Design a binder for this molecule. Structure first.
Ligand code: CLA
Ligand code: CLA
Ligand code: CLA
Ligand code: CLA
Ligand code: CLA
Ligand SMILES: CCCCCCCCCCCCCCCCCC(=O)OC[C@H](CO[C@@H]1O[C@H](CO)[C@H](O)[C@H](O)[C@H]1O)OC(=O)CCCCCCCCCCCCCCCCC
Ligand code: KC2
Ligand SMILES: CC1=C(C#C/C(C)=C/C=C/C(C)=C/C=C/C=C(C)/C=C/C=C(\C)C#CC2=C(C)C[C@@H](O)CC2(C)C)C(C)(C)C[C@H](O)C1
Ligand SMILES: CC1=C(C#C/C(C)=C/C=C/C(C)=C/C=C/C=C(C)/C=C/C=C(\C)C#CC2=C(C)C[C@@H](O)CC2(C)C)C(C)(C)C[C@H](O)C1
Ligand SMILES: CC1=C(C#C/C(C)=C/C=C/C(C)=C/C=C/C=C(C)/C=C/C=C(C)/C=C/C2=C(C)CCCC2(C)C)C(C)(C)C[C@H](O)C1
Ligand SMILES: CC1=C(C#C/C(C)=C/C=C/C(C)=C/C=C/C=C(C)/C=C/C=C(C)/C=C/C2=C(C)CCCC2(C)C)C(C)(C)C[C@H](O)C1
Ligand SMILES: CC1=CCCC(C)(C)[C@H]1/C=C/C(C)=C/C=C/C(C)=C/C=C/C=C(C)/C=C/C=C(C)/C=C/C1=C(C)CCCC1(C)C
Lengths: 99, 35, 177, 50, 185, 49, 170
């Protein structure tokens, strides 16, 4: 029975009526005008633009547990020192004695 | 003292939540006469 | 066969034009080892949090509810002023919607079993994207703003912590060092 | 085919030597804590002002 | 949009940098195209946005230069009371506290909201050309050949005013004097 | 002791585990629940898992 | 048959002569023991570090930034390991070097050329001929700067005289 609770009660009913009202306002009109389109300064040939709009990529790779083990592999076995393993083709196994 | 309190709260909540959501996971079906 | 964002690096095999934010940038190559649907959903969700978070840093910092523990500009130090009671009932509000939008499916092995595309919780009240071109440009805009707002809340927050000054104030005062 | 399902199957497994189950989830930590504190206090504990 | 002086100014066969050739965006149709873009900004950014920015800078800076000069020759009555003797960039700081610059920002931003809408609409094929805000109340751009020329004058005077305003502001930073006082020194 | 705090929570820190650990357990349980056939049945218990 | 750089020695086998600045100079013969591409990447990276270091050594002596205090180049490292900046620089170098690790993994599989990162932000050496001449010039200047940075710093230690100073007064 307070003046401020009445005020908050009107605003609560406003927030409740917003979705049924403006969602339907959106449904009937919508931005399906076939001209509503986002515009940007950079040339669209190379904006790293999305292709196929929403894209969901089917996935059949390693399990999530295996994935976090791979990410753990960054500290357990990084690819750094393998660069300095010996010349892997043949190490000059037939290294001529003169050279 | 507070560190021990929060550790004990963590442990108790962990095991209680396991109990709660485990018996809520269709425990009645886990019998040998199902199907 | 070379990444556009990393010319020196070869393109991640998983990364592709179809994604809508792809510029070939996955130097680590997480894509190869996790559901890219899950990764995109995580990216868009973190960014949708941070996009609101930066504006919050900013609006809370200028205007605020006239309620007694709601007025403390430095957001970092504001989280604790408002009572956790409130912060918890909001955390619970976000829980409801987490499960509402995701429709119960909220694990990596279950989230996308219903065919929901990543990063969509079926929200589109305005700025309709039925136009694939419009969807295509809006998704790149959303991804770029997600990525930018990540850096943002990061800076704003770590910076508010560094100088106990909200965003707008700090720079104007810009007490350095 | 879900991690929670596998966990529930393991907890409610009739193949463990000692059955755990959901009541065992609460029993084993509590009983182990009681055993440990009882052994430690029985072998060595200062006098108590009862 | 035929180009005035095509052959002597703003057209093919007039390439500014002789050794180098211009980007493929710089075609012979654009206004004030002397084939000059060494750093190659044009291939990355769309030419419509670039010309919008050029014309906006030029139009702002012409007003800025004439303001920095006229503010020295004369002043509106009463500004000398509220604002003390205050030249280019000190007057900015004083007027910010005075609140005039807030009003300028508010109203120029209100206009620039529709400028943003115009840039968006042109970049999605509305058919509007850069800098064309439909503002010609005196009907002086009605004749097409005079409009052609006046476009290159607008571009070139915008460029000259940009360089000029940079000059006046940095001369003020050096000597703390206005344009008229600086020239008589 | 004897102060009357709700659930013994005298520090606000104690709430973080108390609310989050059930939420992580709830999230793990939801993956199980969403996989189930959640239509009604006329039986003493559900035999479908 | 025999290296032009070292005529008494025989030509090192892996150093065929394709890489820029290759004069068959590998007396100890590391190329025979390790991948030449990894060694080339190490050479280019160390040399680029050295070229920047040699320039900065002199630029600091002629001009130290006003917001920072004036210290001879070597005295600065110790200053900024505390000022804070030292951390910022070494922090960012590590950040770039993580993607350097990724590029090295590409290099091992042959998907990337040694010392190549597609950095021609302004298209300097976009001519095939020039990119060659530039590659030769780059490797020489790098090989020289490796010596120059060491001299600069070691001279300071033996003689407290920023190179410009010392040269002025021996
Ligand atoms: C209140 C309850 C609630 C509920 C039910 C959920 C539910 C979910 N959230 Mg979370 N979320 C919440 C609150 C909640 N959230 C709040 C308050 C926020 C801040 C705005 C977020 C922000 C958020 C983001 C940004 C993301 C999630 C994600 C998820 C999903 C998986 C989370 C998971 O398995 O974590 C288990 C794992 C951890 C808790 C690890 C945390 C430490 C990391 C690795 C660092 C799931 C739909 C993720 C998702 O959807 O994945 C695609 C995701 O990316 N949530
Ligand atoms: C932001 C600029 C500015 C400021 C701070 C003032 C301030 C003042 N004006 Mg005003 N004035 C302005 C612009 C400004 N004027 C403009 C653009 C015009 C239109 C031409 C006028 C026209 C005007 C007149 C006609 C008079 C003033 C006068 C005055 C002073 C009384 C007062 C301090 C009065 C004054 O003191 O004049 C000496 C006065 O008579 N002003
Ligand atoms: C305060 C409100 C306001 C707003 C909303 C804008 C809006 C705009 N201005 Mg700005 N502008 C303003 C005030 C404002 N202006 C004022 C008071 C001036 C001084 C005269 C200018 C001077 C100005 C110039 C000179 C230019 C713009 C440009 C732009 C556009 C580019 C925005 C962008 O890409 O930002 C991105 C940045 C994010 C941080 C956009 C229409 C540019 C434009 O039209 O480019 C084509 C441009 O060239 N404005
Ligand atoms: C090669 C590595 C290297 C290292 C380890 C350092 C280290 C240092 N330099 Mg720098 N410096 C470098 C290259 C390097 N410099 C180069 C290439 C130049 C020429 C432009 C300079 C020119 C320079 C100046 C003029 C000053 C420093 C100073 C400093 C100190 C603070 C950082 C700073 O302000 O840098 C700023 C330098 C740059 C942004 C240029 C480097 C850009 C390339 C791409 C790297 C620190 C001891 C300051 C000092 O000694 O204060 C006491 C100082 O005043 N340096
Ligand atoms: C955009 C990213 C970024 C950010 C957020 C910072 C932040 C900082 N840098 Mg900078 N810094 C950057 C890029 C960045 N840096 C880069 C790319 C380099 C070269 C690799 C440096 C090298 C650098 C040095 C050498 C120093 C700073 C310092 C600073 C401080 C400047 C604030 C101040 O006192 O005013 C702060 C910690 C100073 C510092 O740490 O002061 C304590 C300092 O001396 N920075
Ligand atoms: C059962 C019938 C016995 C009645 C028990 C009273 C019920 C009151 C519950 C509130 C307890 C309370 O507030 O904690 C308060 C007390 C501890 O709280 C004490 O509070 C004090 C000031 O209030 C100080 O803060 C002390 O530090 C703090 O220990 O709770 C306990 O004693 C620990 C709780 C142990 C719970 C055992 C778990 C039971 C196992 C399954 C649980 C059922 C799950 C069902 C899921 C649905
Ligand atoms: C959008 C998110 C959101 C939702 C959907 C939501 C819904 C409801 C409902 C609807 C069923 C009720 C009935 C309710 C009640 C209370 N809310 Mg809540 N609320 C949200 C957000 C906040 C924030 C930000 C705060 C807050 C608070 C309180 C207090 C304070 C009690 C006290 O402390 O005395 C009470 C009684 C404040 C708080 O707890 O701290 C002072 C606080 O800061 N709420 N709230
Ligand atoms: C989605 C949707 C809709 C909608 C909507 C809405 C409401 C969308 C709202 C989006 C918002 C609020 C986006 C905010 C983005 C903010 C960014 C990128 C900030 C970057 C800051 C940076 C980089 C910084 C910084 C700084 C740092 C760190 C340090 C400081 O010292 C300095 C500085 C401050 C500069 C509608 C309702 C239309 C329906 C539709 O059907 C669907
Ligand atoms: C004979 C022989 C061979 C050989 C060989 C030789 C001669 C090898 C020589 C190798 C040399 C000389 C390497 C030098 C590297 C220098 C670097 C990376 C400098 C970094 C400086 C930095 C980061 C800095 C800095 C700084 C600066 C500038 C500013 C200061 O304020 C701060 C600070 C101090 C921090 C071969 C190759 C054939 C093999 C053969 O079998 C045997
Ligand atoms: C108000 C205010 C402030 C301020 C301020 C402002 C607004 C400051 C600055 C203003 C402006 C207008 C700067 C212009 C700079 C132009 C330059 C350097 C031109 C270069 C030309 C070149 C290279 C020529 C090139 C060439 C030309 C043309 C001809 C030959 C070919 C070529 C080489 C291509 C502060 C910051 C003090 C704060 C204060 O609280 C408030
Ligand atoms: C210690 C330390 C620091 C440090 C440091 C730094 C930056 C140290 C850097 C040291 C460097 C770069 C040393 C380089 C030495 C080069 C030599 C000996 C080359 C000889 C080549 C010859 C003889 C060539 C011979 C030849 C050959 C093969 C072929 C041609 C013919 C000929 C020319 C004869 C600080 C300052 C950060 C402080 C910190 O608290 C700790
Ligand atoms: C601590 C605290 C205080 C008050 C509230 C509460 C108690 C809850 C608690 C909350 C803490 C929170 C919410 C912390 C969140 C942390 C955040 C948002 C951290 C963000 C960090 C971001 C960082 C590094 C970004 C760095 C990015 C870099 C270099 C990117 C580099 C680049 C990349 C990747 C590609 C292009 C080239 C470029 C741009 C150089």
């Amino acid at each position: 029975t307070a003046p401020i609770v009445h005020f908050g009660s009107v605003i609560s009913l406003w927030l409740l009526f917003a979705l049924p009202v403006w969602s339907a306002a959106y449904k009937a009109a919508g931005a399906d005008t076939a001209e509503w389109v986002g515009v940007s300064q950079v040339t669209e040939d190379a904006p790293g633009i999305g292709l196929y709009g929403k894209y969901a990529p089917e996935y059949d790779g390693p399990t999530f547990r295996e994935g976090l083990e791979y990410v753990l592999s960054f500290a357990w076995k990084p690819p750094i020192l393998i660069a300095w393993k010996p010349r892997a083709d043949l190490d000059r196994a037939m290294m001529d004695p003169a050279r | 003292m507070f560190t021990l309190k929060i550790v004990v709260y963590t442990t108790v909540t962990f095991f209680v939540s396991l109990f709660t959501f485990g018996f809520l996971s269709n425990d009645a079906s886990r019998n040998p006469n199902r199907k | 066969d070379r990444s556009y964002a990393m010319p020196f690096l070869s393109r991640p095999p998983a990364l592709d034009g179809s994604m809508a934010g792809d510029v070939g940038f996955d130097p680590l190559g997480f894509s190869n080892y996790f559901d890219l649907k899950w990764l995109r959903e995580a990216e868009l969700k973190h960014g949708r949090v941070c996009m609101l978070g930066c504006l919050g840093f900013l609006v809370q910092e200028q205007a605020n509810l006239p309620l007694p523990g709601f007025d403390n500009k430095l957001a970092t130090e504001a989280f604790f002023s408002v009572p956790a009671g409130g912060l918890w009932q909001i955390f619970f509000s976000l829980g409801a919607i987490e499960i509402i939008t995701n429709k119960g499916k909220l694990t990596p092995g279950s989230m996308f079993t219903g065919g929901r595309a990543p990063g969509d919780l079926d929200f589109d009240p305005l700025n309709l994207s039925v136009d694939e071109t419009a969807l295509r440009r809006f998704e790149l805009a959303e991804l770029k703003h997600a990525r930018l707002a990540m850096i943002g809340l990061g800076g704003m927050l770590h910076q508010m912590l560094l100088t106990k000054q909200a965003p707008i104030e700090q720079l104007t005062n810009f007490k350095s060092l | 085919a879900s991690a929670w399902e596998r966990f529930c199957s393991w907890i409610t497994s009739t193949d463990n030597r000692l059955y755990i189950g959901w009541f065992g989830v609460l029993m084993i930590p509590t009983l182990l804590t009681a055993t440990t504190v009882y052994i430690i206090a029985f072998v060595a504990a200062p006098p108590v002002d009862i | 949009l035929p180009l005035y002086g095509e052959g002597k100014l703003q057209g093919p066969g007039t390439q500014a940098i002789p050794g180098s050739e211009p980007p493929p965006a710089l075609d012979g149709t654009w206004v004030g195209d002397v084939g000059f873009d060494p750093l190659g900004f044009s291939r990355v950014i769309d030419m419509r946005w670039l010309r919008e920015a050029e014309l906006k800078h030029g139009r702002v800076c012409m007003l800025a230069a004439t303001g920095m000069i006229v503010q020295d020759i004369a002043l509106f009555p009463g500004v000398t009371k509220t604002f003390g003797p205050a030249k280019i960039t000190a007057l900015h700081d004083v007027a910010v506290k005075q609140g005039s610059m807030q009003q300028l920002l508010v109203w120029l931003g209100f206009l620039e909201i529709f400028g943003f809408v115009a840039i968006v609409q042109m970049l999605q094929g509305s058919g509007r050309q850069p800098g064309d805000f439909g503002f010609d109340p005196l009907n002086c751009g009605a004749n097409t050949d005079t409009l052609a020329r006046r476009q290159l004058v607008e571009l070139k005077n915008g460029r000259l005013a940009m360089i000029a305003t940079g000059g006046m502001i940095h001369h003020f930073f050096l000597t703390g004097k206005g344009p008229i006082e600086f020239i008589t020194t | 002791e004897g102060t009357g705090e709700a659930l013994g929570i005298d520090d606000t820190r104690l709430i973080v585990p108390v609310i989050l650990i059930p939420v992580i357990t709830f999230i793990l349980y939801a993956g199980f629940a969403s996989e189930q056939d959640n239509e009604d049945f006329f039986d003493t218990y559900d035999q479908r898992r | 048959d025999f290296s032009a750089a070292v005529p008494f020695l025989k030509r090192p086998s892996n150093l065929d002569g394709t890489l820029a600045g290759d004069v068959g100079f590998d007396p100890l013969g590391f190329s025979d023991v390790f991948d030449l591409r990894v060694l080339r990447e190490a050479e280019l990276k160390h040399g680029r570090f050295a070229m920047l270091a040699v320039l900065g050594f002199l630029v600091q002596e002629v001009y130290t930034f006003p917001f920072f205090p004036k210290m001879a180049p070597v005295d600065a490292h110790d200053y900024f390991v505390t000022q804070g900046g030292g951390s910022q620089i070494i922090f960012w170098i590590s950040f770039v070097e993580i993607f350097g690790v990724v590029a090295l993994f590409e290099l091992i599989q042959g998907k990337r050329d040694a010392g190549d990162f597609a950095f021609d932000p302004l298209g300097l050496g976009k001519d095939e001929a020039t990119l060659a001449r530039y590659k030769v010039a780059e490797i020489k200047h790098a090989r020289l700067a490796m010596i120059a940075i060491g001299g600069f710093i070691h001279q300071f230690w033996v003689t407290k005289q920023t190179v410009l100073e010392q040269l002025g007064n021996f």
